[PDB]
Design a protein around this ligand. Structure first.
Ligand SMILES: *[C@@H]1O[C@H](CO)[C@@H](O[C@@H]2O[C@H](CO)[C@@H](O[C@@H]3O[C@H](CO)[C@@H](O)[C@H](O[C@H]4O[C@H](CO)[C@@H](O)[C@H](O)[C@@H]4O)[C@@H]3O)[C@H](O)[C@H]2NC(C)=O)[C@H](O)[C@H]1NC(C)=O
Ligand SMILES: OC[C@H]1O[C@H](O[C@H]2O[C@H](CO)[C@@H](O)[C@H](O)[C@H]2O)[C@H](O)[C@@H](O)[C@@H]1O
Ligand SMILES: CCCCCCCCO[C@@H]1O[C@H](CO)[C@@H](O)[C@H](O)[C@H]1O
Ligand SMILES: CCCCCCCCO[C@@H]1O[C@H](CO)[C@@H](O)[C@H](O)[C@H]1O
Ligand SMILES: CCCCCCCCO[C@@H]1O[C@H](CO)[C@@H](O)[C@H](O)[C@H]1O
Lengths: 326, 11
């Protein structure tokens, strides 16, 4: 017996010594040193200091620059907003709770925190899916005479919200649950304790297939064709050095975007799938946070890849940050 | 493709 069950939680620590407390009531300093909690707080603090400016400046320059307000950029703003949800929903809260040693906001706060953090990360997730689709449609042109505009673009943004709620809301109403996670300071989906009262086994697979596999495939197809469409058009146009550069620059970005997507969500997949295969073994608190470490940082490196390596967002940002010059 | 590549921000 490697854990300690409760009504609305699961502390990954044996209570054979009588020391385990509810993560809503007393600090869990027995499953992690108090400095490990400070380091958690340190890390949360970092993601606020980087995540908030970068994602907020993305929203700010779009207000200052008419040329950023194009339909093919809507999904990118949605992304920055999704990260802001990840910041003020998950990072700020976890910073506060880490400094007490337990999730002081009770199970109610556990559902709020878990909802908005899950909502933020999934809006961002499907935002990447939608963006990949749009680029496939725009570049590869599968539909003759089709034109991508403001109407289609708003559909794309709403689609992420439906997909995200399709993942973040069922745990509020009984198809999974938000419980304290890892060092018990942040709340997430219970993917690792069979809870037939909420049918976690089904939800994990729903998550794994719908939310993970489907995006992984869409993003691989959409970007697969795109490099192909660009490779071919370059070969037929080898007399154009620019068209040869674009092919190389685009191939590079496609690799970065794909790889980044894997780093963000592959860990989570690998761990959850392991727990599903190797059910309910001794998984430590810090073990649980390693998946959690990678997608949370996406709130910083997604805006870097998608906004800051976008040539215009960058120039508008530089001009904005340099008082209107350059 | 170039004009379509700039509209999506990939080049
Ligand atoms: C991890 O394990 C520990 C130890 O097993 C466990 O903590 C224990 O919880 C029980 C409550 O379930 C505590 O028992 C209480 O002890 C006090 C005095 O010692 C009693 O007054 C309590 O109430 C009794 O008496 C009342 C008279 O007014 C009755 O009305 C009442 O119904 C009870 O009969 C109760 O006995 C116990 O003290 C702790 N032990 C320690 C060391 O803290 C903990 O809950 C476990 N963690 C999890 C998450 O399950
Ligand atoms: O109000 C003047 C600006 O209007 C447009 O800006 C908006 O364009 C869309 C509606 O026409 C909005 O959905 C979008 O969010 C805004 O960027 C126009 O594009 C700007 O050039 C005008 O200055
Ligand atoms: C922005 C950062 C806010 C940090 C607020 C920390 C409030 C800590 O509050 C303290 O938590 C301790 C456990 O850690 C308890 O033992 C103390 O009783 C409690 O006063
Ligand atoms: C393969 C994925 C299985 C589904 C459960 C993993 C969900 C991890 O956790 C959930 O998803 C969010 C994604 O950012 C986490 O960051 C949140 O803490 C939580 O809402
Ligand atoms: C799913 C999207 C991943 C596509 C990455 C393709 C990278 C292959 O590499 C590409 O092909 C050339 C060989 O013809 C390489 O020499 C170049 O590095 C590059 O243009």
């Amino acid at each position: 017996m490697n854990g300690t069950e409760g009504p609305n939680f699961y502390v990954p620590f044996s209570n054979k010594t009588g020391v385990v407390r509810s993560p809503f009531e007393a600090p869990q300093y027995y499953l992690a040193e108090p400095w490990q909690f400070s380091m958690l707080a340190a890390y949360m603090f970092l993601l606020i200091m980087l995540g908030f400016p970068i994602n907020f400046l993305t929203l700010y320059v779009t207000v200052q620059h008419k040329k950023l307000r194009t339909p093919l950029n809507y999904i990118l703003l949605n992304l920055a907003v999704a990260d802001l949800f990840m910041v003020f929903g998950g990072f700020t809260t976890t910073l506060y709770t880490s400094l007490h040693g337990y999730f002081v906001f009770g199970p109610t706060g556990c559902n709020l925190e878990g909802f908005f953090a899950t909502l933020g990360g999934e809006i961002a997730l499907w935002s990447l899916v939608v963006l990949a689709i749009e680029r496939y449609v725009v570049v590869c042109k599968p539909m003759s005479n089709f034109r991508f505009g403001e109407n289609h673009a708003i559909m794309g943004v709403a689609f992420t919200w439906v997909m995200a709620l399709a993942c973040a809301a069922p745990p509020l109403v009984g198809w999974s649950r938000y419980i304290p996670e890892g060092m018990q300071c942040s709340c997430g989906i219970d993917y690792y304790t069979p809870h037939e009262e909420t049918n976690n086994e089904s939800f994990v697979i729903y998550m794994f297939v719908v939310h993970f596999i489907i995006p992984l495939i869409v993003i691989f197809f959409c970007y697969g064709q795109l490099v192909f469409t660009v490779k071919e058009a370059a070969a037929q146009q080898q007399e154009s050095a620019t068209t040869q550069k674009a092919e190389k620059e685009v191939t590079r970005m496609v690799i970065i975007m794909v790889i980044a997507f894997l780093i963000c969500w592959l860990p989570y997949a690998g761990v959850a799938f392991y727990i599903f295969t190797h059910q309910g073994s001794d998984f430590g608190p810090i073990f649980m946070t390693i998946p959690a470490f990678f997608a949370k940082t996406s709130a910083v490196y997604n805006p870097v890849i998608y906004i800051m390596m976008n040539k215009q967002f960058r120039n508008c940002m530089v001009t904005t940050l340099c008082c209107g010059k350059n | 493709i170039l004009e379509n590549l700039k509209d999506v921000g990939l080049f």
